[PDB]
Copies of this chain bind each other. A is one copy, B any other.
Amino acid sequence: AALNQALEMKRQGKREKAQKLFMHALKMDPDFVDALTEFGIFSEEDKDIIQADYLYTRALTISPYHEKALVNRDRTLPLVEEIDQRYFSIIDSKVKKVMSINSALRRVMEETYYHHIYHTVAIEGNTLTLSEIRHILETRYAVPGKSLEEQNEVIGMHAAMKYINTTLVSRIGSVTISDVLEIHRRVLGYVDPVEAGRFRTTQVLVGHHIPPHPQDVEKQMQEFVQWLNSEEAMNLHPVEFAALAHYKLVYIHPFIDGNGRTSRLLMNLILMQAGYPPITIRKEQRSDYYHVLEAANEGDVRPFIRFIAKCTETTLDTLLFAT
């Protein structure tokens, strides 16, 4: 198809030109095995083994026996497992330096705390500025010309964080379904006190994703918390555990609202319980954040795991910048 033009293009370079044809052929058919497999060998020439591997894996989900994808995938499968293991051990070092450590650390933590709220709420259309958030929380006085729902999204954010940082981080034992609802009760309670702290009673669409039926939400959550307390989960790297817990909850979409915020908090609880600072997915990463969630729903949660790892690294880089 358009693939052959990219292959001829690929020769003689104009690679930026070959990329567009590969990308266009992918838009016309994202399940085109020969385009995936050839675009992966293209991605490797640019030293992008992680993306090359993505495309060989997408290809073999569509065509399990495609020889060209197979011989490449066998090759990159564990090369990528190492590359990924390595990134995690790089994050661990930055965590050590941070946990090695004060005047300027304490100062950073606050600046950060209000910055987390600004980003967790802003990502989904909340128009409050960081100064307005600091105002709402410090003074307890409303902000002029801004909706009450927006300001109550902030109060609940702080109420929930307080509760986690005080009642759950230091606590020993199993993470319960009850804790998750307690987080949600605070997260959403000031905006919707009837729906906060209880599961979805209706079926919904979330982009192109239809989550479990409200009849199934409770079992899917019991299975989720079983997993959160499993050895399998505690044997993961905290970053991979956190990212998976974030995703798994988002996939269940147990509440009618405030799912993304509880997932980001649960993720930060998992991380903080493993001695990691709380991560912030910035407002500006919404497009990337949804692309990795889409690829995850499509079958590969690694880019989501990697997305959260780059968020983890950035958060630490920002902390160590105050050296």
Contact = CB atoms under 8 A, between A and B. Distances in A.
A280 interface: no
Interface stretch (A4-12, A150-158, A171-179): A150-158
List 5 tightest A-B contacts by C-beta distance, closest first: A189-B193, A144-B144, A142-B142, A142-B148, A193-B193
A150 to B, nearest CB: 9
A54 interface: no
Interface residues of A, number: 26
Given A189-B193, A196-B193, A146 B142 contact: yes
A147 B141 contact: yes
A155 B148 contact: yes
Contact of A156 (B140, B141, B147, B193): B193
A178 to B, nearest CB: 13
Query: What's the number of copies of this chain in the assembled complex?
Result: 2
A185 interface: yes
Interface in A173-202: 185-186, 188-191, 193-194, 196-197
Contact of A141 (B146, B159, B197): B146
24 contacts: A140-B147, A140-B149, A141-B146, A141-B148, A142-B142, A142-B143, A142-B147, A142-B148, A142-B151, A144-B144, A144-B145, A148-B148, A148-B151, A148-B152, A148-B155, A152-B190, A185-B193, A186-B193, A188-B193, A189-B189, A189-B190, A190-B193, A193-B193, A193-B196
A191 B144 CA distance: 19
A133 to B, nearest CB: 13
Contacts of A194: 185-186, 189
A141 B147 CA distance: 4
A70 interface: no
Nearest to A155: B148
A169 interface: no
A206 B155 CA distance: 29
A278 to B, nearest CB: 22
Contacts of A197: 193
